[PDB]
């Protein structure tokens, strides 16, 4: 970022530090992939076995992407008003 | 110099306030004026200078 001295732009901009501090415990899944669950249930305990992201997850969230191929059964998770309706239209269940 | 800048607050003591400079040797009356509140959407006296 050196520009001949003359106080460079990366020092004239303000400092930040406050962040959401939860990415290492928060998993993000989308209805366009790993959403058939092979007849099983979508749950935080089975996500920790689904060959994805590992065991340190404390929160799992869902986003509405693509279309829902199965009458999927979900227990818990943080799920949008759209994702709850895209699964309803496919014959699925959301347990909370 | 060194007069210290004035702070003017409404009677609710809220975190929205005006800041200005005033001459120390003229007009010793308290600086107060009637102006708007950004949440209550009404005119109030802003006062309590020094």
């Amino acid at each position: 970022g050196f520009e001949g001295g003359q106080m460079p732009l990366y020092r004239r901009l303000p400092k930040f530090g406050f962040t959401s501090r939860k990415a290492a415990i928060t998993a993000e899944i989308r209805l366009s992939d790993l959403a058939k669950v092979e007849g099983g249930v979508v749950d935080l305990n089975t996500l920790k076995a689904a060959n994805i992201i590992g065991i340190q997850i404390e929160f799992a969230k869902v986003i509405l992407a693509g279309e829902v191929t199965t009458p999927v059964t979900v227990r818990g998770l943080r799920v949008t008003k759209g994702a709850r309706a895209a699964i309803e239209a496919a014959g699925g269940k959301i347990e909370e | 110099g060194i007069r210290e800048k004035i702070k003017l607050v409404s009677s609710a003591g809220t975190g929205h306030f005006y800041t200005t400079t005033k001459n120390k040797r003229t007009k010793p009356e308290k600086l107060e004026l009637k102006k708007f509140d950004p949440v209550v959407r009404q005119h109030v006296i802003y006062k309590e200078a020094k």
Partner: protein, 64 residues
């Protein structure tokens, strides 16, 4: 070796849904006694780096 992320940039610039990096405007914190709202409110919409100015952070954010 891995190369480090530069704190000069990683406490200044953020990533978005478009190529480049998004930042705040300065001249909004220190002594506002002579700054009317028409010279404060308008300093909050944020701006981007995206030209020959991006080639100055291309080794500052090597993992963004």
């Amino acid at each position: 070796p891995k190369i480090k992320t530069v704190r000069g940039a990683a406490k200044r610039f953020k990533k978005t849904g478009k190529g480049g990096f998004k930042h705040k405007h300065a001249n909004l914190r220190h002594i506002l006694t002579k700054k009317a709202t028409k010279r404060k409110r308008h300093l909050r919409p944020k701006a981007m780096v995206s030209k020959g100015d991006l080639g100055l952070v291309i080794a500052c954010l090597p993992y963004a």
